[PDB]
A and B are shown apart, each in its own frame.
Chain A
Amino acid sequence: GQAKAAPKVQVYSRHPATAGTENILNCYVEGFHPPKIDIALLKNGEPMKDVKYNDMSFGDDWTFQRLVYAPFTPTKSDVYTCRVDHEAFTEPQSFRWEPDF
């Protein structure tokens, strides 16, 4: 029938991160089909401000890709997550940013 393919997800910073230094937080969501998706950037479970969405792309197997990014100044207590909801998931899934520091 139709494709149903869940995404895989990579979270990462534009630069090597240092505590209190302004940076950019990237969430790259790929491999999904169909295109309907929700992708949220969370600071300790709060919606982040200034979240932007790249134009979605797809590749040779027609599965879609999306980049979602937002400015952020990380610390050692803060937990940054990307929460992705997609019909091939039984339920939303978080993917955590793992610090550089």
Chain B
Amino acid sequence: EPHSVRYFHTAVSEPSPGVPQFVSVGYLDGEAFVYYDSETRRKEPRADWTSAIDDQQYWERITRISQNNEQIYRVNLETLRERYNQSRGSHTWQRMYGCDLLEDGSIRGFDQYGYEGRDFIALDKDTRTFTAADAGAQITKRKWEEEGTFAETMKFYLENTCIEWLRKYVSYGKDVLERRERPEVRVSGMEADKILTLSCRAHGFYPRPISISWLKDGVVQEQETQRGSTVPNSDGTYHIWATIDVLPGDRDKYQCRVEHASLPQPGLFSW
């Protein structure tokens, strides 16, 4: 029942292959559903539910909004060049903003900006003031809090518009969002110098949260385990592994344990 809508903007002075001058990706509960860049200059879908939105010339309009705003990203890129006394070259401007619905129905909002891969300025919409990270950021704090309008305008969107679209988005993608897909689990064995390296792999689970652990005759082995980060598949599902180094006679005491929302009780797997 909690949900998220976030937009990620990347803007750079010098394009490069696969890096346009400006790109924007919208995510629903972490899965892409809307894309735009300054080469195609067109808002395009990234999820199937977006295809039955019911707004008619919504795509034409939001495309135009984006086309118009990449002017302002180019300006802010030069402002930031001169404010930080850099040369002309490669610089990078980044933005993440959006809203959350928590399980009690309350709302959160965020608007964060990043220059050169470092924090720059963040909205604290509770106080309608910006937290600056910098001498250079302190200016934009003072210019934004002088004019008076942006903080509350962005607080408005975050608390109203954003949330209004979130709920509509959740009900179009109800079926994708609530589907569940079990993991296929396989345990692999490889010993070299009298050390058996057991590798447990969980493929294709949705949703993303997972527990994977290792059991030695039924007792967790939390320090002898290293696990990878949950990483994405191409079809919206996820992937994780967990290895353990153990000794080849201690082989039939070893179980991988996979707790996932898709299974009522944890699965157990051996090699």
Name A residues whose Cβ lies closer than 8 Å to a Cβ of B: 1-3, 5, 10, 12-16, 24, 26, 28, 33-38, 52-58, 62-64, 67, 69, 100-101
Contacts and interface: CB of A to CB of B under 8 A. Distances in A.
Given A13-B203, A15-B184, A35 B234 contact: no
Contacts of B10: 35, 56, 58, 64
24 contacts: A2-B90, A2-B117, A3-B92, A10-B231, A12-B201, A14-B233, A14-B235, A16-B203, A24-B234, A26-B231, A26-B233, A26-B234, A33-B92, A34-B92, A34-B117, A35-B10, A35-B12, A36-B16, A38-B17, A54-B232, A54-B234, A62-B117, A64-B10, A69-B233
A56 B234 CA distance: 13
Given A26-B231, A62-B94, A53 B203 contact: no
Contact of A10 (B35, B91, B228): B228
A74 B158 CA distance: 48
> Interface residues of B: mostly helix, strand, loop or mixed?
strand
B32 interface: yes
Interface in B185-223: 186, 188, 201, 203-204
A13 B202 CA distance: 10
Contact of A67 (B19, B204, B229, B234): B234
Nearest to A69: B234
Residue from B35, B90, B233 with most neighbouring chain A CB atoms (10 Å): B233
Contact of A56 (B18, B228, B239): B18
A16 B19 CA distance: 33
Interface of B: 8, 10, 12, 16-19, 23, 25, 32, 35, 46, 90-92, 94, 96, 114, 116-118, 184, 186, 188, 201, 203-204, 228-229, 231-235, 239, 241
Contacts of B186: 16, 100
B116 A28 contact: no
B18 A34 contact: no
A82 to B, nearest CB: 13
Contacts of A10: 228-229, 231
Given A3-B118, A10-B228, A15-B184, A55 B233 contact: no
